[PDB]
Amino acid sequence: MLDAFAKVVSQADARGEYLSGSQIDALSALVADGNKRMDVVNRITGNSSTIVANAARSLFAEQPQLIAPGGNAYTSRRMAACLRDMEIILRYVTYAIFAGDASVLDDRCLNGLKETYLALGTPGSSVAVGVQKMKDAALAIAGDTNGITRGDCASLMAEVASYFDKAASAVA
Amino acid sequence: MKTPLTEAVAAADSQGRFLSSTEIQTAFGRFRQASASLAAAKALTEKASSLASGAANAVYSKFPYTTSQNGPNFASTQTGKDKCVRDIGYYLRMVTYCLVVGGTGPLDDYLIGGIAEINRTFDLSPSWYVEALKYIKANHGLSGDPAVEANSYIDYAINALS
Numbered sequence: 001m002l003d004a005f006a007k008v009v010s011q012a013d014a015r016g017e018y019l020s021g022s023q024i025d026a027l028s029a030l031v032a033d034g035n036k037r038m039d040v041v042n043r044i045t046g047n048s049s050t051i052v053a054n055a056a057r058s059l060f061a062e063q064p065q066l067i068a069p070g071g072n073a074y075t076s077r078r079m080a081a082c083l084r085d086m087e088i089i090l091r092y093v094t095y096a097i098f099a100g101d102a103s104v105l106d107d108r109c110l111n112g113l114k115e116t117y118l119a120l121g122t123p124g125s126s127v128a129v130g131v132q133k134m135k136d137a138a139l140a141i142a143g144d145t146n147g148i149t150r151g152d153c154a155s156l157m158a159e160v161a162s163y164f165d166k167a168a169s170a171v172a
Numbered sequence: 173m174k175t176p177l178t179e180a181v182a183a184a185d186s187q188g189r190f191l192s193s194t195e196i197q198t199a200f201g202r203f204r205q206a207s208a209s210l211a212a213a214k215a216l217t218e219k220a221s222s223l224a225s226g227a228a229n230a231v232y233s234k235f236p237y238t239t240s241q242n243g244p245n246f247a248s249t250q251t252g253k254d255k256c257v258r259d260i261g262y263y264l265r266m267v268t269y270c271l272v273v274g275g276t277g278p279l280d281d282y283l284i285g286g287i288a289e290i291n292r293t294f295d296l297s298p299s300w301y302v303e304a305l306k307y308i309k310a311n312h313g314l315s316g317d318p319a320v321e322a323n324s325y326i327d328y329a330i331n332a333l334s
């Protein structure tokens with residue numbers, strides 16, 4: 001896997017170059033947002049159970065056929081698998097946010113997901129609604145201006161939303 | 173690639189865990205070190221042409237056979253001399269990468285893994301590179317944290333060769 005730093009280096013090595021002063025400044029800007037990124041990782045992690053539960057509760061309320069008998073999330077083993085999948089996808093979103101690169105999410109998590117559900121009979125597009133409901137909740141917990149030093153997190157917030165969006169467009 | 177952040181993520185993933193304050197304190201250590209690392213990366217890069225050429229010359233003085241002995245592995249020809257400074261410029265460029273990510277990952281991945289096989293097949297002596305790397309360390313002109321952490325990576329290369 002790569003982080004935001006490694007990613008730049010690996011695109012430079014393939015060209016045989018040293019990083020430019022420009023590239024170095026941009027990575028400095030990333031280091032400048034270091035604490036803010038860790039507050040996002042900390043916050044979503046600290047509420048991870050609640051984000052998962054509340055997301056699944058709202059999915060099953062909107063989409064009652066997944067839980068009716070015969071539904072892909074009917075029976076305890078299937079329900080347990082579904083909540084497990086939601087927790088896994090959140091965990092690897094928080095990895096990508098920590099490292100400031102999507103490698104780990106694509107490589108370890110998303111890769112081959114859509115074909116797994118296709119083989120299983122699991123409705124990918126319902127999986128994607130679940131991911132979206134976890135997105136809104138997480139952006140709201142990470143953006144809470146209480147009990148933190150005020151500042152601007154707007155790029156970070158954009159970067160986070162993209163990793164969820166990358167998860168949702170993968171399975172759907 | 174091995175960096176403090178991909179190490180921390182790998183440990184959590186290996187245990188199927190979310191990240192904890194443990195892994196955050198690793199990010200905190202990396203982000204605070206990154207000023208000296210990056211300031212060192214900029215410095216080496218500014219000098220890179222001249223350190224590489226000076227380091228090649230330092231080898232050719234320590235080991236004058238390398239310029240007078242016959243055979244494609246020696247710098248007794250124009251191509252050999254070009255190949256030699258090209259090689260040293262690769263070591264130096266890897267060490268700047270290592271500064272940028274804060275760990276040995278670029279060295280391991282691009283340079284160190286395999287190098288024994290290459291040195292034996294092409295009959296290149298490790299001792300030529302250890303000499304070039306001791307020059308670089310004596311001449312890069314860094315001080316303080318920048319120098320301590322650049323030297324760390326140069327000494328890692330040296331120890332992989334010895």
Ligand SMILES: *[C@@H](C)[C@H]1/C(=C/c2[nH]c(/C=C3N=C(/C=C4\NC(=O)C(CC)=C4C)C(C)=C\3CCC(=O)O)c(CCC(=O)O)c2C)NC(=O)[C@@H]1C
Pocket residue numbers: 032033034035036037038039040042142143144145148149150151152153156193196197
């Ligand atoms: C956007 C994400 C929000 C935001 C973030 C923000 N935080 C800081 C400052 C810091 N955050 C921390 C983080 C931690 N300290 C710890 O001990 C732990 C647990 C192990 C964590 C995760 C730290 C150390 C700081 C700096 C010290 C401080 O408390 O200020 C800032 C200020 C900028 C800075 O980096 O110093 C900002 C802007 N602020 C918001 O308004 C968004 C909701």
Ligand SMILES: *[C@H](C)[C@H]1/C(=C/c2[nH]c(/C=C3N=C(/C=C4\NC(=O)C(CC)=C4C)C(C)=C\3CCC(=O)O)c(CCC(=O)O)c2C)NC(=O)[C@@H]1C
Pocket residue numbers: 066071072073077078079081082083085086088108109110113116120122123126127130
């Ligand atoms: C919940 C939102 C939805 C749902 C999910 C569902 N998933 C499974 C089965 C699998 N899910 C995975 C996915 C992964 N496993 C991993 O280890 C990783 C990351 C490293 C991922 C993303 C896999 C591989 C399976 C198959 C293995 C297994 O079932 O344990 C099920 C079970 C299907 C079954 O027939 O048992 C279910 C139910 N179901 C829905 O209805 C929701 C939309």
Ligand SMILES: *[C@H](C)[C@H]1/C(=C/c2[nH]c(/C=C3N=C(/C=C4\NC(=O)C(CC)=C4C)C(C)=C\3CCC(=O)O)c(CCC(=O)O)c2C)NC(=O)[C@@H]1C
Pocket residue numbers: 228231232238239244245246247248251252253255256257259260262263282283290294296300301304
């Ligand atoms: C300089 C200190 C001495 C020296 C140099 C010399 N090197 C070669 C040839 C090779 N060097 C490499 C090494 C690398 N290639 C890589 O991709 C990497 C990591 C990114 C490194 C460090 C390789 C693979 C070769 C062989 C293939 C090639 O030619 O590129 C030669 C030529 C040897 C030959 O037999 O053709 C020479 C001359 N020689 C000296 O005498 C100097 C003291």
